Amino acid sequence: FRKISRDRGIIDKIISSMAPSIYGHRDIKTAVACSLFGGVPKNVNGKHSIRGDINVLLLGDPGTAKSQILKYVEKTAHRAVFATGQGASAVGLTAS
C-alpha cells in the first residue's frame, strides 16, 4: 500500500479503478472515490461538530448506469447497505 501510494498519479488510477464495467462517467467515478474514502469528522471542544463524509447525489436520465454504480459500491465498500424507496424486499430506511 505504501509502495502504490508513492506513485504520483495514484488518485487517477483509483478513479480508473471505480466500476470497470461502467464507461465514460469520470466525474461520477471521482465522486464515488471521494465518497468511498471520505473525509474526517471533527468536534471542536465538544461543542461544535463538523460532519466528515461525502454525500453524493447521482441525478440522471434512464440508461446512465446509476444502479450499476450503486451495485459496484455495494460490492467494494466495507459496510455498504443497499436500500430503495419504491421497492419492498429490502431493508427499510426508518427505525422501527
Partner: protein, 48 residues
Amino acid sequence: MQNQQEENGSEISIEKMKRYITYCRLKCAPRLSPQAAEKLSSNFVTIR
C-alpha cells in the same frame, strides 16, 4: 483558542454551563421592580 479562553475564564465549558442553567432555574425567579414597570409600559404603548 477556545481551550485558552476557558482557562482564562472568558468562556464556560458546556457541562458547567448546563449545571449553572439548572441551578439558576431551580433557585432564582426574579420579579420586576416597581420602578421598572413605567419604562416597560411606556415603551409598549409607543410601539403600538
